[PDB]
């Protein structure tokens with residue numbers, strides 16, 4: 571078979587405003603096999619309450635899933651999503667950029 | 671317009687860790703309406719849309735028992751394919767299936783299909799005639815000859831032309847589709863030296879299909895534009911953006927265009943400081 575490397579986007583549900591509660595998403599797509607480990611991190615530390623959508627797959631057979639967590643952005647806090655998957659030698663970390 | 675009823679099936683082995691995980695998901699018009707997840711003590715087919723609770727307990731017992739039977743067949747299939755490919759018993763493997771019917775505006779069958787994959791690659795597919803099979807490798811050829819000699823394509827043609835269209839014809843029948851128009855805005859970001867990034871956002875739209883472009887003097891900037899893949903907000907709506915790098919002070923020479931089926935006409939917008 572094949573392995574497909576996950577594609578990752580990290581972004582908020584609503585346009586971010588400092589001090590206002592929001593939802594941070596980690597949208598992970600285009601991967602195979604379906605087993606995957608997704609963590610969300612605040613200032614380098616794992617965020618406990620991360621919810622996972624049900625997994626789905628596309629017409630090309632590759633899987634996708636949405637991880638999400640409540641968060642209240644501030645000017646200086648850093649958020650990231652880290653994904654471990656057999657297609658990759660090491661876990662991939664993608665940082666939240668509030669402009670993207 | 672057309673309508674679709676499709677089922678997406680996944681079976682994943684996990685040797686040493688327990689029984690394979692099995693999932694069936696039903697979609698009407700690319701929208702999830704039923705799901706069966708094997709990962710439970712008493713797994714049940716569940717409704718996933720607001721209209722499916724109309725069905726009685728007779729419907730759910732039959733579909734649950736159907737899905738449990740399918741689950742046990744795919745458990746066997748996973749073992750069968752280890753034999754066909756001469757793979758060891760220790761590894762995890764995945765079988766996937768897409769099965770369904772698409773009908774036109776007139777209620778006639780447009781396309782019926784049944785497509786299988788193994789570990790992310792095409793395995794076997796029922797052809798459009800609904801009478802013959804295309805096998806992707808010499809393993810799948812073994813399945814093909816078995817199914818040709820068992821009247822499987824006959825059993826499938828009768829499901830796809832018969833029961834599928836019948837269930838589809840009555841499912842969500844309520845036939846017309848939701849649209850939520852995008853709201854758009856442009857943001858402005860600094861770049862090294864004498865350049866700036868303009869980013870055109872579309873938010874809160876449904877369905878996902880959308881096009882964003884940037885124009886300088888009437889022509890679309892295909893080459894220089896950065897795009898993200900369309901992504902879910904998590905509330906049912908989608909997001910997308912497109913950006914371009916432009917000279918400092920020339921921001922008003924660029925126009926974002928947003929095209930979406932929900933809009934009376936496309937949005938045009940510029941950076942508004």
Ligand SMILES: CC(C)C[C@H](N)C(=O)O
Nearest residue numbers: 747750765786812813816
């Ligand atoms: C993967 C499945 C389509 C395998 C099929 N049931 C066979 O035994 O050949």
